[PDB]
Amino acid sequence: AKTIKITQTRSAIGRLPKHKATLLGLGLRRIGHTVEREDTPAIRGMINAVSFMVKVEE
Amino acid sequence: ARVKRGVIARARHKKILKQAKGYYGARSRVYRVAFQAVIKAGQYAYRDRRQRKRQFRQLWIARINAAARQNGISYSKFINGLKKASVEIDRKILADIAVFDKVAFTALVEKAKAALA
Amino acid sequence: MYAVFQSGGKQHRVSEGQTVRLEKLDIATGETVEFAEVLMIANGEEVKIGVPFVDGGVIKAEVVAHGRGEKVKIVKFRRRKHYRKQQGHRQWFTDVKITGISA
Amino acid sequence: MKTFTAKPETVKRDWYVVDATGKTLGRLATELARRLRGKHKAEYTPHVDTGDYIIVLNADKVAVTGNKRTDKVYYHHTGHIGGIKQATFEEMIARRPERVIEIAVKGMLPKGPLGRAMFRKLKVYAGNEHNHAAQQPQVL
RNA sequence: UGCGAAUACCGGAGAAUGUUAUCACGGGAGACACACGGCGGGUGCUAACGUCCGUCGUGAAGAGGGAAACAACCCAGACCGC
RNA sequence: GCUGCGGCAGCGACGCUUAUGCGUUGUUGGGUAGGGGAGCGUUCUGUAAGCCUGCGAAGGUGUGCUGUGAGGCAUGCUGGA
DSSP: OOOSSEEOOSOOSOOSSHHHHIIIIIOOOSTTOEEOOOSSGGGHHHHHHTTTTSBOOO | OOOOTHHHHHHHHHHHHOOTTOOSTHHHHSTTSHHHHHHHHHHHHHHHHHHHHHHHHHHHHHHHHHHTGGGSSOHHHHHHHHHSOSSOOOOSSGGGHHHHOHHHHHHHHHHHHTTOO | OOOOOOSSSOOOOSSSOOOOOOOOSSOOOSOOOOOBOOTTOSTTOOSTTOOSSSOSSSOOOOBOOOOOOOOOOOOOOOOOOSSOOOOOOOOOOOOOOOOOOOO | OOOOOOOOSSOOOOBOOOOOOSSOGGGTTHHHHTTTTTSSOOSSOSSSSOOOBOOOOOOOOOOOSSGGGGOOOOOOOOTTOSSOOOOOOHHHHTTSOOTTGGGGGGGGSOOSTTHHHHTTTTOOOSSSSSSOOSOOSSOO
16 A cells, blocks of 8 residues: 555656656656545555655655 | 838847947847847846856855855855754855854854754 | 845845845835834844844844835846747846835 | 955965975865865855965975876977977976976866966975075965 | 466456546648667677667757766756746 | 746636636646747728827937837937928
8 A cells, every 4th residue: 555645756757658657647746746645555556666766755 | 012121120120239238240230140149148148047046056155165164064064053953044145144244154153063963 | 233034035134234025915015014024033143142043032023114116127038949939028026125124 | 235245356365384395295286276266265255366375395295195106197298299298207207396296286276367367376496494485474 | 389477458347646638520730851779679790870670768849957078868858037 | 856935828726706807726838840829010091181290290310118029108319391
């Protein structure tokens, strides 16, 4: 899980398909922008591809 | 049915030709200047004002690093002391205290030196 | 006594100095309402008691004068690639003056 | 107001006297180059005209670290083509510390004009104290 | 090829998110010389800032920071002013 | 790049007000070919023997204010309708 409250990692346009997984998906725009999603399993899927990539901190 | 360009013809050239500085040779006398040079001016200008915000900062720290270190702790350690505070954080710029209120500044280096855990 | 504060840039180096700043909000015209700044004060910093903080007791602020909040400045500022030219543009503010009483 | 202390056109000049008879050689240049600019200096906004005033002594007592005593490219080619290039190792040149070695600061300064203002204007010599052809007055 | 991944692709539900991003029909197009870098390959000598496909990213049509100086590499994408 | 402060414009909302509109807010605003949308200015026609003018028109040159820009105006001087 661990997805409740996540701020973007730090990267402009460079990925290929993960951008849908995040910016176009999760709802993150520009770095540092944090989003707070629910705390259920279904969401972990998105952060996984971007594991060390994104930043979920607490 | 009259373009009679003459009518704005003049006003346009005159407009850009209005480069007081004169710059040098053709750079005022000839229309050639305008979009060649008057245009460069606009370009060189576009970046310098915004790129300048830092060129001074580079100076601000250049002097703080040159003032604060003379009395213990380098600029690297300075802002770190300063860093620890509840309200104590007044940024640089005014940081030039080293020029007018030396006593303040050196009384401010302790606010950091003695501050560094 | 010296002065010090931020609000749209740390512009508060000079003592009283009456220097430009930012803008009220709803409107500018002059007069006043008596707006104390905040204890960003360098303790005012100015006397036998120049203090590292600025924090030298609760409440310490100067009242805003509101000298003249108008004017602009105009700067062309125009970019252009090799096929275009946004060359045509302009954005300014009025920076209200403010004299500021004593610390 | 606009913060930046002006340029009083090289306002003050604090005189000094290094020793050079030390053992730091090349290391010394930096605190010798930083000085003629705005090192110990706080105010007097550099970038613009400025400087200080120190002076070297014998300096002939240097060894560098590694076998640099034996290296250092050093050539002062001239506008002469015809295949010139005057290479001389450090020790070969250390025989008469001239515009070089002690002058290792030149390559360390802003270069060109203004930086050029400080340049050799610190004096060098190679004998320490004896007949200081240089200004005897106030120094540290 | 008597075995067989990753994986891409196909369809089914589900929560959330993205100023229907999707599809259809209709007006106007331009566009079919692309170059480089990474990965998978034909070629060529696992030669070429070589050449021909695939795929992803950048340039083209992106300024800024970075690798001295280097369109394509790295970072980061420029509404204006401080 | 992000943040802070001010300002501009498009859209969704919010506060209301409510043709409407404005303040708050979220967000969008690199750009060749090219598509779409708004405008400035010039010569000529209507509105015009109305209005401006020899107590000085057009034009030339300076200046000041003004608009996002194309440009706008006010006026010194020249100028002679």
